[PDB]
Amino acid sequence: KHICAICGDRSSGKHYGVYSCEGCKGFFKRTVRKDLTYTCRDNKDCLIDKRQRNRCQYCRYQKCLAMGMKREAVQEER
Amino acid sequence: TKHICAICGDRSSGKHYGVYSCEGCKGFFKRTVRKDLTYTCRDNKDCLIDKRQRNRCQYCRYQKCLAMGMKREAVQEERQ
DNA sequence: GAAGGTCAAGGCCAAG
DNA sequence: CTTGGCCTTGACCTTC
Ligand SMILES: [Zn+2]
Ligand SMILES: [Zn+2]
Ligand SMILES: [Zn+2]
Ligand SMILES: [Zn+2]
Structure with a gap:
């Protein structure tokens, strides 16, 4: 029915x-929750698709935000 | 007036x-009675069931639903 | 009011 | 270790 706006994989x-x-x-929940920061080993423009999404966390978070993922919708830890 | 849940003390709707x-x-009660679910307590069936500790034990949450007066008979069948 | 249903938020834990 | 699949929960809603 739908596809992920960040990597192209099947969207629930x-x-x-x-x-x-x-x-x-x-990945986005974990990053907002633990307040993680990543470093890009390349030129901050890595291909984020089904096969490459775990190659660069920096660029994956970067895509999450750019595609409209809201940090505020991530509720607090139990 | 305003009421609080008889099972965990959360606000009552x-x-x-x-x-x-x-x-x-x-x-919780609806899905338990409907799917005729059976749980098992990992402790000795005395778990505290409050607003922030209710999903820690499904067995005890259900027990307090019955002990407090919830009726299995009031849970209807799926709207086909 | 009090039944019903929905679905994005949660949590767990096996896969990776 | 982190990733992600699968199932539970409950805020918000409609149906009776
Ligand atoms: Zn994706
Ligand atoms: Zn990168
Ligand atoms: Zn309650
Ligand atoms: Zn228990």
Whole structure:
């Protein structure tokens, strides 16, 4: 029915405002929650697709935000 | 007046299966009675069931639903 | 009011 | 270790 706006994999439905896969939803939650920061080993323009999404966390978070993922929709830890 | 859930002390959205409960305890009881679910306590069936510790034990949450007066008979069948 | 249903948010844990 | 699949929960809603 839908595709992930960040990597192109199958989308379950919307998560944090964006149509995304379980992977991308999980990764964005974890980053906002633990307040993580990553470093790009390349030139901050890595290909984020199903096969390459775990090659660069920096650019994956960067795509999450750019595609409209909302940090505020990530509720606090139990 | 304002009411609190008889099972966990969360805000009560009204009476549900005869008992003043919240949307959480209401939901939980429905899915338990409907799917005829059976749980098992990892401790000795005395777990505290409050607003922030209710999903830690499904066995005890269900037990307090019954002990407090929720009616299995009030849980209807799936709208086909 | 009090039944019903929905679906994005949660959590867990096996896969990777 | 982190990733992500799968299932539970409950805020918000409609149906009776
Ligand atoms: Zn994705
Ligand atoms: Zn990169
Ligand atoms: Zn409750
Ligand atoms: Zn218990």
